[PDB]
Design a protein around this motif. Structure first.
Motif, mmCIF file in Angstrom:
data_model
loop_
_atom_site.group_PDB
_atom_site.id
_atom_site.type_symbol
_atom_site.label_atom_id
_atom_site.label_comp_id
_atom_site.label_asym_id
_atom_site.label_seq_id
_atom_site.Cartn_x
_atom_site.Cartn_y
_atom_site.Cartn_z
ATOM 1 N N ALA A 196 45.914 -4.168 26.795
ATOM 2 C CA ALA A 196 47.161 -3.767 27.443
ATOM 3 C C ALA A 196 47.131 -4.085 28.935
ATOM 4 N N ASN A 197 47.607 -5.180 29.277
ATOM 5 C CA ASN A 197 47.839 -5.512 30.678
ATOM 6 C C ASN A 197 48.368 -4.311 31.458
ATOM 7 N N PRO A 198 47.598 -3.492 32.091
ATOM 8 C CA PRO A 198 47.983 -2.321 32.880
ATOM 9 C C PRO A 198 49.218 -2.569 33.743
ATOM 10 N N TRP A 199 49.585 -3.844 34.068
ATOM 11 C CA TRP A 199 50.642 -4.072 35.047
ATOM 12 C C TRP A 199 51.972 -4.355 34.355
ATOM 13 N N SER A 200 52.013 -4.322 32.922
ATOM 14 C CA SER A 200 53.291 -4.513 32.240
ATOM 15 C C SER A 200 54.202 -3.304 32.422
ATOM 16 N N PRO A 201 55.311 -3.470 32.907
ATOM 17 C CA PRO A 201 56.232 -2.356 33.140
ATOM 18 C C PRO A 201 56.463 -1.509 31.889
ATOM 19 N N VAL A 202 56.353 -2.056 30.822
ATOM 20 C CA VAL A 202 56.596 -1.343 29.573
ATOM 21 C C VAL A 202 55.266 -0.990 28.912
ATOM 22 N N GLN A 203 54.964 0.316 28.928
ATOM 23 C CA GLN A 203 53.748 0.780 28.268
ATOM 24 C C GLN A 203 53.935 0.850 26.756
ATOM 25 N N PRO A 204 53.059 0.421 26.054
ATOM 26 C CA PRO A 204 53.176 0.437 24.595
ATOM 27 C C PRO A 204 53.425 1.837 24.038
ATOM 28 N N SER A 205 54.332 1.999 23.108
ATOM 29 C CA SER A 205 54.645 3.278 22.479
ATOM 30 C C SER A 205 53.669 3.592 21.349
ATOM 31 N N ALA A 206 53.543 4.818 21.083
ATOM 32 C CA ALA A 206 52.694 5.230 19.968
ATOM 33 C C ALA A 206 53.085 4.507 18.683
ATOM 34 N N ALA A 207 54.357 4.254 18.506
ATOM 35 C CA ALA A 207 54.872 3.538 17.343
ATOM 36 C C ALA A 207 54.377 2.094 17.323
ATOM 37 N N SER A 208 54.409 1.512 18.362
ATOM 38 C CA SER A 208 53.944 0.132 18.460
ATOM 39 C C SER A 208 52.455 0.029 18.144
ATOM 40 N N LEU A 209 51.628 0.952 18.794
ATOM 41 C CA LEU A 209 50.187 0.948 18.560
ATOM 42 C C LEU A 209 49.875 1.197 17.088
ATOM 43 N N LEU A 210 50.703 2.098 16.422
ATOM 44 C CA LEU A 210 50.524 2.385 15.003
ATOM 45 C C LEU A 210 50.877 1.169 14.154
ATOM 46 N N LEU A 211 51.965 0.525 14.435
ATOM 47 C CA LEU A 211 52.383 -0.676 13.721
ATOM 48 C C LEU A 211 51.332 -1.775 13.843
ATOM 49 N N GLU A 212 50.791 -1.922 14.979
ATOM 50 C CA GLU A 212 49.766 -2.935 15.215
ATOM 51 C C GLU A 212 48.520 -2.666 14.379
ATOM 52 N N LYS A 213 48.205 -1.367 14.359
ATOM 53 C CA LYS A 213 47.044 -0.986 13.559
ATOM 54 C C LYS A 213 47.276 -1.279 12.079
ATOM 55 N N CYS A 214 48.485 -1.031 11.580
ATOM 56 C CA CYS A 214 48.838 -1.255 10.182
ATOM 57 C C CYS A 214 48.857 -2.743 9.856
ATOM 58 N N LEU A 215 49.263 -3.511 10.668
ATOM 59 C CA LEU A 215 49.292 -4.956 10.473
ATOM 60 C C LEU A 215 47.879 -5.529 10.448
ATOM 61 N N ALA A 216 46.940 -4.979 11.417
ATOM 62 C CA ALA A 216 45.557 -5.443 11.495
ATOM 63 C C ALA A 216 44.785 -5.084 10.229
ATOM 64 N N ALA A 217 45.163 -3.947 9.538
ATOM 65 C CA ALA A 217 44.474 -3.479 8.338
ATOM 66 C C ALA A 217 44.977 -4.212 7.097
ATOM 67 N N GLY A 218 46.031 -5.236 7.174
ATOM 68 C CA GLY A 218 46.620 -6.015 6.097
ATOM 69 C C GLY A 218 47.435 -5.176 5.130
#
Lengths: 56, 50
Positions: free
Chosen positions: A4-26
């Motif tokens: 997570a690029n600390p300098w991105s104005p938009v901090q990742p949402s819990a939903a996004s982090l969860l979706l990413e995790k679900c996609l990584a697990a196939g």
């Protein structure tokens, strides 16, 4: 580990982090997420006020 | 919104009409200060000659 690029104005949402995790697990496919894409407009009233201010 | 857009169209039209009336006023910035000096001399001479 997409650091997570600390300098991105938009901090990742819990939903996004969860979706990413679900996609990584196939367990979820991007195709399944795309088919589920809701184009529902968010904050419509705030946008209208911005346009009026510009015209003024 | 509908009222603001109508106000823009009205003012824009008024400006276009005034710019067309002022075509002779828009030409070359000759140094206004120089013309006045010259006029001053001519008037002063005229007064002296009269």
């Amino acid at each position: 580990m997409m650091a997570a690029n600390p300098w991105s104005p938009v901090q990742p949402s819990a939903a996004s982090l969860l979706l990413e995790k679900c996609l990584a697990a196939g367990v979820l496919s991007q195709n399944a997420l795309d088919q589920a894409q809701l184009e529902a407009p968010c904050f419509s009233h705030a946008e209208e006020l911005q346009r009026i201010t510009e015209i003024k | 919104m509908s009222n603001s857009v109508e106000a823009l169209l009205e003012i824009s039209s008024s400006l276009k009409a005034l710019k067309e009336e002022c075509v002779d006023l828009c030409s070359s910035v000759t140094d206004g200060d120089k013309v006045i000096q010259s006029l001053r001399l001519a008037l002063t001479d005229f007064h002296q000659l009269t």
